[PDB]
Design a binder for this molecule. Structure first.
Ligand code: NA
Length: 240
């Protein structure tokens, strides 16, 4: 997250760190959201590589013992069947991970609440992105979980020629684009949290930014719109 601030350690208890085994250690690669005690939602492009993955819940500082982490292997990966890795702009950038064990819930570990199917945010709706991604374009991962305020940019604007044009679809949410705050590498798969009727819900799964940089004016961060995939998510969990 570029232009973020450190999150309080109990603000975003559905955030997870998806990590891969890297020699004798583990490395953060992307974010995700806990949606059942044994299921995580992330981006499809995050699990394109044939790596050994684990999920960490209750994480705050990737480089220090927080005393709150639970570590759990990934048992099954279900990517959306229409996902195509060489066309992220087509959409369907979503995947569900079944965990080897069910995690225990507490003030650091909670299920993300999802929006009702079909919900679309009005333009300029207040949202936060969260994650451990790069803190500058071509920078390094954050140590501590970051948050940045990214108001939504509606489809009519986002799909205009000076923004994303045809690259943005109605199955996506755009947020940000002010040139200072954005998602960045390592934030993929993590949540966009939006405040609606007094309650934060996860409306987006971080999908892409510009190839010209993370925080680029009129290139808001693009998220998979969770509310377009409620039936899909429910169908996968019920059949696994
Ligand atoms: Na930690």
């Amino acid at each position: 997250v570029v232009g973020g601030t450190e999150a309080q350690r109990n603000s975003w208890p559905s955030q997870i760190s998806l990590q891969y085994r890297s020699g004798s250690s583990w490395a953060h690669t992307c974010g995700g959201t806990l949606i059942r005690q044994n299921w995580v939602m992330t981006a499809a492009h995050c699990v394109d590589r044939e790596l050994t993955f684990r999920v960490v819940v209750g994480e705050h500082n990737l480089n220090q013992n927080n005393g709150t982490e639970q570590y759990v292997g990934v048992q099954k990966i279900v990517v959306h069947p229409y996902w195509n890795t060489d066309d992220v702009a087509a959409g369907y950038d979503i995947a569900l991970l079944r965990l080897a064990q069910s995690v225990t819930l507490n003030s650091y570990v909670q299920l993300g609440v999802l929006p009702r199917a079909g919900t679309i945010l009005a333009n300029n709706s207040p949202c936060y992105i969260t994650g451990w991604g790069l803190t500058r374009t071509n920078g390094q991962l954050a140590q501590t979980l970051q948050q940045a305020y990214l108001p939504t940019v509606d489809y009519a604007i986002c799909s205009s020629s000076s923004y994303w044009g045809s690259t943005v679809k109605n199955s996506m949410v755009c947020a940000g684009g002010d040139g200072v705050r954005s998602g960045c590498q390592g934030d993929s798969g993590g949540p966009l949290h939006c405040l609606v009727n007094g309650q934060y819900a996860v409306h987006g799964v971080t999908s892409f930014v510009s190839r010209l940089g993370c925080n680029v004016t009129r290139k808001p961060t693009v998220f998979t719109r969770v509310s377009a995939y409620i039936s899909w998510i429910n169908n996968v969990i019920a059949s696994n």
